[PDB]
Swiss-Prot record:
Domain observations: This protein has four EF-hand domains, three of which may be functional calcium-binding sites.
One CC-aspect GO term: motile cilium
Positions of Ca(2+) 1 binding: D61, N63, T65, K67, E72
Family of the protein in this entry: Belongs to the calflagin family.
Ranges where the EF-hand domain occurs: 48-83, 84-119, 130-165, 167-202
Name of the featured protein: Flagellar calcium-binding protein TB-24
Keyword Manganese found: no
Subcellular location: Cell projection, Cilium, Flagellum
Length: 220
């Protein structure tokens, strides 16, 4: 049934490998890029953050609307921020960030269900990315090399280390089962991290822009 494909390479019933064209990349390259990015992407709504926040916003909002969606946002970075260089295939990274952000936005407070992102939900979105990056770069090292899976091993080591990150999974084993959904025996970065980033977001989602963090001072 047809004959004109000649011959080519072959493989077995599995191929957890990739080919970028004799490129190559590891913590080294991932470290320098994430270093410039991390520096660009805010993480504490500081003076430099507030400004940038408005800058990048006016960017995607070059159409004049104030109500952006996902598709428009995706291409925005995918074409401007160009996060591909560092992370291989990140159209999904922003996808999950845009979705959750919007939803998680109302839940806490209440502004009505919609589908677009506002200056507020936008701030939460960026946070998702920034965090998701810290993890990947923080796991690849405490984990294996050409791998992206997690196991009870890095779990007990990351459980504590994670606590420092900013979140507090408290109960571990119980969570390992929750985040899990394939029923195999392990969890992938994007999954384990999702639980982290999100949490760190619901806890640090506190609208600062003011002065009311630590206590005022000593009493007696």
């Amino acid at each position: 049934m047809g004959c004109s494909g000649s011959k080519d390479t072959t493989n077995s019933k599995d191929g957890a490998a990739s080919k970028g064209g004799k490129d190559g990349k590891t913590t080294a390259d991932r470290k320098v890029a994430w270093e410039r990015i991390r520096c660009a992407i805010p993480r504490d709504k500081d003076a430099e953050s507030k400004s940038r926040r408005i800058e990048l916003f006016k960017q995607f909002d070059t159409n004049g609307t104030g109500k952006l969606g996902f598709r428009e946002v995706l291409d925005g970075c995918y074409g401007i921020l160009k996060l591909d260089e560092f992370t291989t295939h990140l159209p999904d990274i922003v996808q999950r960030a845009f979705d959750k952000a919007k939803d998680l936005g109302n839940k806490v407070k209440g502004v009505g269900e919609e589908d677009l992102v506002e200056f507020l939900e936008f701030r939460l979105m960026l946070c998702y990315i920034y965090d998701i990056f810290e993890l990947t770069v923080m796991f690849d090292t405490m984990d294996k090399d050409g791998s992206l899976l997690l196991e009870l091993q890095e779990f007990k080591e990351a459980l504590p280390k994670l606590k420092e990150w900013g979140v507090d999974i408290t109960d571990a084993t119980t969570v390992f089962n929750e985040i899990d959904t394939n029923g195999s025996g392990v969890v992938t970065f994007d999954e384990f991290s999702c639980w982290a980033v999100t949490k760190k977001l619901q806890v640090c989602g506190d609208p600062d822009g003011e002065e009311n963090g630590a206590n005022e001072g000593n009493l007696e």
